[PDB]
């Protein structure tokens, strides 16, 4: 029961969406061996994703957790980096910090999981990680925290806890990274579809 709501570029939906794809775009240690090289993103679509029934699910599940953390769902607006992001947006997230489900806050950090582990081969097309011509497809998500786990960086959430915060204690300008071991925390909110763009 998915439906895909494209949003106009116009859109102050659309708007406040593309500002944190672009703005929270890093340069990552692997000099861009996993994702590609880029500062920036072409945004091509910015599509609101409605769903009844996973919705009503996250927000069940978010009610819990609020409820055993003094009325406070920690909740977050996070990206997630996949190829099955089509299994994803029908039929919901399925099950470094563990074997769970891993969001970021830097865009360009979720931009390296798109193809696969480390990026994979690359792009289906070309078989090239930095491919500046392929459409790549990133989700923004409504994430349920709760009390997190710290762990200072380079399943079941560990017990009294609903997720896992990766600090990062030695990366200089990196943001946070966290887990969820249960799918029902995170709701896929917006599809992006984007270019990776090559620097002049
Ligand atoms: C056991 N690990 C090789 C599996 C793994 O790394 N899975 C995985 C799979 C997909 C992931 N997608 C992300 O957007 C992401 C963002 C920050 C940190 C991790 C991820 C991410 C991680
Ligand atoms: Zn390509």
């Given at each position: 029961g998915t439906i895909l709501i494209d949003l106009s570029p116009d859109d102050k939906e659309f708007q406040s969406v593309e500002e944190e794809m672009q703005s929270t775009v890093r340069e990552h240690r692997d000099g861009?061996?996993?994702?590609?090289?880029?500062?920036?993103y072409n945004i091509l679509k910015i599509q609101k994703v409605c769903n009844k029934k996973l919705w009503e699910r996250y927000t069940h599940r978010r009610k819990e957790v609020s409820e055993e953390n003094?009325?406070?769902?920690n909740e977050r607006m996070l990206f997630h980096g996949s190829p099955f992001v089509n299994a994803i947006i029908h039929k919901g997230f399925d099950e470094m910090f563990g074997a769970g489900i891993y969001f970021a806050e830097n865009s360009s950090k979720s931009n390296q999981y798109v193809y696969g582990?480390?990026?994979?081969?690359?792009?289906?097309?070309?078989?090239?990680?930095?491919?500046?011509?392929c459409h790549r497809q990133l989700l923004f998500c409504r994430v349920t925290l709760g009390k997190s786990f710290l762990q200072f960086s380079a399943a079941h959430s560990?017990?009294?806890?609903?997720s896992v915060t990766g600090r990062?204690?030695?990366?200089?300008?990196a943001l946070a990274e966290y887990v969820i071991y249960?799918?029902?925390?995170?709701?896929?909110e917006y599809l992006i579809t984007y270019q990776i763009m090559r620097p002049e």
């Open positions: 861009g061996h996993a994702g590609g090289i880029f500062n920036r003094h009325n406070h769902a582990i480390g990026g994979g081969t690359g792009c289906p097309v070309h078989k090239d990680r930095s491919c500046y011509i560990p017990p009294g806890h609903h990062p204690s030695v990366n200089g300008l249960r799918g029902e925390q995170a709701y896929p």
